[model samples]
Target chain A: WEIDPKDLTFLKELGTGQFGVVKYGKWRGQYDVAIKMIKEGSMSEDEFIEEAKVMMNLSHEKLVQLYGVCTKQRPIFIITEYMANGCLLNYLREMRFQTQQLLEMCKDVCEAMEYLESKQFLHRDLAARNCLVNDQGVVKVSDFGLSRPVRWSPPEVLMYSKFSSKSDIWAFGVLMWEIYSLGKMPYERFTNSETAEHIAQGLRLYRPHLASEKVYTIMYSCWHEKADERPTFKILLSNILDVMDEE
Target chain B: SWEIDPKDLTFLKELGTGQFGVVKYGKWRGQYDVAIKMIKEGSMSEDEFIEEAKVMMNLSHEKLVQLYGVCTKQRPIFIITEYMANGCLLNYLREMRFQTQQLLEMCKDVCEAMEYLESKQFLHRDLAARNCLVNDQGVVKVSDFGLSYVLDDEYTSSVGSKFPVRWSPPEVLMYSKFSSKSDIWAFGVLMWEIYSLGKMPYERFTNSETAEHIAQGLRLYRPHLASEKVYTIMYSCWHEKADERPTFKILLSNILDVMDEE
Candidate 1:
């Protein structure tokens, strides 16, 4: 049976863009979900199918959950678990807090990163915007649109580059900087192209003033020039927990 | 500004529940249609606030859901977002009435959304059908930003421990590090999801069993490839190294190329 339009009780317009709009709604007396309505001609049949496939199996504590989908109508409706907090970036920039307090916040992020690593999933895009938090400061990772899987062997190379756990490490390092800086935009000190070039050249970001020495050391280790040199998520967790226990 | 009290909300109905929080259909000002995520009391402290908020705010993409507001009162807190009409991608697939063309459109929408996320210098660490949303008009919006992070310069191991292995790349499983290339590996699984049409990844195996399989270097087999172009793209995305996968720009272009040839 197709999802009846009347069945979707639109709560309000969550957000909008050129392609379509996202509405927060309830479904079948069970769940609260976010429904995306795609604009006509913005995407093809193949694209929708591929997205549906990806969303079906991918699940993690940090990532958002996909509930179900509706394709019977002209424009399909993709339903996903709703995240209460918006993007992490907005919280960092908008919320007022002290330095030490922010460090604890960073710790929550590290916990999520540790979880991603444990799952063998690479959060290729780790940014303030992609992360979400509730009022109690419990953090959850979200937005898997750019997410993919990595193989162990030297799999066939695509024309475009693939994402790996190591690259996720790199992103995590940048996220640390953002967290320490209280949501400073990535590469604020350098131009976008310059930052990319530096990353390409194996340049690592220096630790900011507010960052603890222990945290800085951990950040450096993650951003090592060679991917192989980076520490695994298990090791990272041990070290952080060690520091936390010491404190 | 800050959030209003959770007690202030007019509880309408229970929306959903998870390990961390429960969602409720509520009215904030007695008019706004919103979903309030009521977090368990004392579960989080003030110190954890900045990191969670930063991660959510920085993620600005079209496919992802937008956070509306937050309310911290008493010990628990409430998070609000725009309500969606559709339920989940998996529910639709279970119904199994979509045509091949419709499936293709969904895939393209997902990839395009992913491309936009990557362009903004972010990655969806947990990309799955469950995270993608489809509205009445057939538009797809990717939501859920709890597992996201910013690309930083350092490679800290302490940060990698929280991820699970089932959806992770082999290298991430073995080494605990990840990059954009690793995300491609997850994309391969997404491809599997599309091909299987809501079948659980490695359903035959338990969690530990799947972990063992991954530890043994086992890759999820693609039963019937979607298409030659799609297959090639999926294969490339699952490369072992974080650097080998195609960039979002390239993936977008390749999709266009496939369409051109078709």
Candidate 2:
């Protein structure tokens, strides 16, 4: 509600996606921000405002900050924190950071997902590809458009299209796998069917290079077939933080 | 399985650059001619490559490009497969005429591939004419048909940037939902491409507009070359409710019947 459509200048397109485009923006005076504008004629006015409200209220350090929204405009504009480093997947590919750094990165994301879990929000898409990195190098959870589903999804979610905090936990396991592998695709060259079969059979990914057995083991537990079997995101964050502190 | 030694592998001319690296036409142990998908270290996962290897393994079919082996005595990963000399199905369609029978064969080939994956129970969330490959023998192989667990980094820049909004089903477009049934919807769109000679399903609309268009119980007009019967089958795949779409089993049988009439 604090966002004024007249005050924002959409500078340059940072990324173009299925549902919308994110642009580099200058907010009232000189505050730098990422302007996310969803196309108009695509949503009812109420749907637009509801999304803005949800985003504005769910604030946390590890989550991308929602600065404000102008939903009454032609293209509904919702400005959020600008992640200078782009997507975590692109960031990892550009620079092969050290081994322990992957551990630290996953910890940052878990804390975010943990907060999201506490708020009862399900990040249906949570991979290195979905998370972004700021100039300060913090990994924050982000979801804009619907990203393609990953191999990390549990069988229940895949079979039934279910999304809960547990499914987020399932995705976190795959996210953990991605960090250890430094943003590698999970499920190898497996076709959609084979990957689903592997998950249905309760198979987890093989440990990646540079990942300690302990880390992979934690990642493995997140993929437990039963929803209740998986650890809470907060607990996983605590366990991961504890592991990072050990070394 | 013998370890795929990098030293034993020979790289030839480049086919094209993919998200991973330069995809090349190469040879293995001076024996089999292959297509090599180069996956870089930092961007790719060993976990996924292993899964892809297993998926490619033991799956042999006339309409599927064979994934032969993987080379890992290195940082850059190489996935070897039997080469489809002609190239992508979409490009080939441009030069070819639909003229009824010929276009029908393309539809039938894609249906068979869909039938195969359907039997395996793997839903292709992204099946389209662009995703298939045409062999030199003029055979259409279902290729690049499915989504990677969500992070194919390739998907982010490519598939993620803008979805094939026109081709995807309502469940997928609305909720990012995918199923064998949803793939059946894509198959209908693919059928449309075969007859339309790879023209886009919804040529006039923006991505956002297209999703709304499909949601309103509208579908593409009958492709020019599709026969009334074949067009009906195509229409059946575009059912508003995913479950209403015919199973690939029924689709293949109907396609073969249409071919019989031809």
Candidate 3:
């Protein structure tokens, strides 16, 4: 859907930047949406269309839907579904988050990644803060921007920005470690360079105190140096489900 | 069916990333340390997310992938469910190889999954090897329902669809007309995938090219691994007319018969 730039009113903001700002806005006077206004030259027009098209083709329950765009002029406005809970880590800190809900959130986004895997698209960034939640506690996967991912990322991914289905799987294992530690960094207290060196040497973060053997096994496989050895998204979702089913 | 309380839960580790968020390994209510999917606030809203959970809630079975619950009232949203320890079937084939009997069992497993899905009037639109998961007990659970939806007879697309072209049938590519039969057609491709040990059916063709060739009544060759009888069952699923296509019940029964014969 195409939105009229004039119809959107930015009420409050999530995160602001020189490039753009994520605004909690009302579209067409009635609909509540998140509007991201990227400055005219912040990103190339072609890049905008490419990213927009990927979101356009996606509409699974766990993904953040790209409602529409206003790109005829400067400060291009890209609108999407808005979560009430804010970033996932912040929500986990503010609320009494349940372990089951943590599992639920992982399953939701895993399905989303499975969807993307079916689409041949790659999610280069996967972290807790990028995930959003609404009042019902539903988690929607959203990519706001890139960040220092030495914690969640594998050696090749962090070093080269290189990615594939397997690379994402490696990051997923790191992501699992973070959740087990209540949003703790994968390699806490380690400098970025030191962390990268450790990761390159085939070092993995020590198992979190709470990670069950089943959960750690899944995470451990994801950190393999050989990308092909990593499980695919479909397998990850399935493996996760078995862990749940056994319980 | 239950609310996941923060205090009752324990975080295990990070899972992977999604388009807008990351997944985690955590225990819910201190019972099951299942996988958790978390999304950011600006990506999606509460009301819209819950609306679909009603439909997802309606679906459950042994063969079908189960959705445990959704935590919509919190910060990053969460979808938690069962955890399969092994992995998906195709990767399992690539990793720990399976023989013909096991291969046939996987097909029967998927056929039954489709049968259950079709009984309630849903289409497993993305039916492929990569879409199915296998657990440690070697049980195959059909998953990747991200493309599955409630519909029957026929369907069309107003906006473009990102279908796996090689797996899709003629009607789906030409008219976006999908149904249980279209799924059956893809099932045929899936059979080819298993017999070939997880190779892409038409790995050489581009999406458009594959569409054109398949539209012209071109079909894939029999995998050397498949027996003549098994190959016949696979071929029967590729009938040109949707009505001519076999239902999941019929396909499931046929595979069962094959299993019996074996």
Candidate 4:
């Protein structure tokens, strides 16, 4: 759907990224909406349109809903449902939760990833910050605009600039580590170069104090050196649900 | 010292219409853009006009909207002031997605201006977001001095005079008493307005209900955007005993700490 620029009124800055700022706004003075106003010249128009196209095509309870886009003007608008709690990382950093709660959060993301995988779309950027938490503390995948932070990238993505569902699986494991570590940066003690080399050599993140061996094993499975050996989101979601059920 | 020629004031367009006056976007001597508030003839007496003009003349600060001049000799009378490009602070808050820093910056500007007013021993009885303006450079300046009062020994309003009930503290609500401390209470409500993105301070409660609740030690809760640290300052402004409330100078210092921490 397309929205008229006049109907949207921006209220407060939610966050900022490389391209532009995201703001909390009203849609036609009725519903709350998060508006991503792309900065002019900061990104190519077609590149942003590609992002809008990808997001507009997908819809699930675990994914951020795209309401509409305003492509008629410069600094194009991508309007979506408002998430009051903001980024998953920020929420994780602020509040401590039980292992089951963290697994459910992981389940929330995996459910969305499973849907995207079924649709044959790659969530090139999948991390804690790329997800948002609603007022109910439900984590939903967002930020279709991609990034290339070396730490979240799998070895293949780093060496050959390859991105696949498998790369996303690796990133999802890191995201799990982020949740269990309570939003600590992945490989906090190492630089990007060091992290790249370490992951390439089969090194893995240590088990989080909050995660059980069962949880850690699932994360390890997703980090397998061979992309084909890594489990799909359907399998991962089932594994997380199993852990959640036991706990 | 504060007179302007009627012929020199050129009304360009109507800016706003209010109960007391009509403000027009005007040009002075066809040169400088100014906001001309034409007072309704019966709304205020000549004595009240003199008091407002006298107060406006003595005040000068970057955070206070500078009064250009006034024309009393004209039919409706004119109070010309600096034209703020962005209009009222309340509307701006509702319109833009102001970052916490920007909100703090606006609050800081208002507090500094109020500190100056406190030093001069004047009380801005009406200090809500509606009475503040934002200039072209996005700087907020306090405006609307018609309800302002030069200090006395706790000047009390006459039996039937009007006041802003929701913004008033228990002292002002119960006894019609006015003081700098009462203005501090109003400032707290204004800060609530800023952080709540210009929502009405007590939207669900009626004037009588709000006054009753305030008398029973009720205060506004923290806004979503405000931390406990900032809400503590707001709560401090609303101490039931006027003497217990922090002065604008102390408030300015406290707000400075909040702003400068980031």
In model 1, where do residues sit more than 4 Å from their true spots? Answer: A1-247, B1-11, B15-23, B27-33, B40-47, B147-163, B206-218, B223-225, B259-262
Q: Candidate 3, residues B79-118: lDDT per residue as tens digits?
A: 6656665555665666554689988998988888889889
Query: How well is each residue in B1-262 modelled by candidate 1, as lDDT tens digits?
Result: 3445555567456543221112346676776666544443223344465467556666666556656566553323456655555545655565556655566666677777777767665766777775666665666666655523222111112212224345677777777766666666776677667766766677566545666886665667764637766778767776655687788678767767776675
What would the TM-score be for candidate 3 when compared with the true structure?
Answer: 0.50
Q: Assess each prediction's global lDDT (C-alpha) against the native.
A: 0.58, 0.71, 0.69, 0.76
Ranking by TM-score: 2, 3, 4, 1
Candidate 2, B212-240: lDDT as tens digits: 98878889999767778988999999999
Best by TM-score: 2
lDDT of model 2 at position A101: 85
Give the Å shift of residue A64 in candidate 1. Answer: 29
Model 4 Cα lDDT, one tens digit per residue, B132-176: 999888899998765332111111111112346778888787788
Candidate 3, what DockQ? 0.02
Across A58-156, the per-residue lDDT of candidate 3 in tens digits comes to: 888888877887766433567778776666666556556566766677787788888878887666677776677776888777762211156667767
Q: How do all models score by TM-score?
A: 0.45, 0.51, 0.50, 0.48
Among the numbered candidates, top lDDT falls to 4
Worst 10 residues of 4 chain A by lDDT: A13-22
For candidate 2, give the lDDT.
0.71
Q: Model 4, range A1-247, lDDT digits (tens) per residue? A: 6788678675654332211123567888887887554432233445456666766779899998888877665335567788888778768877858777898899999999999999888777688877989889899998654321677888899899788899999999999998999887777677667778988987789999998999999988989888999999999999998877788
Candidate 3 Cα errors over 4 Å, as ranges: A1-247, B15-23, B39-45, B146-162
Give candidate 2's error at residue B115 in angstroms: 29
**Model 4 residue A233 lDDT score:** 96
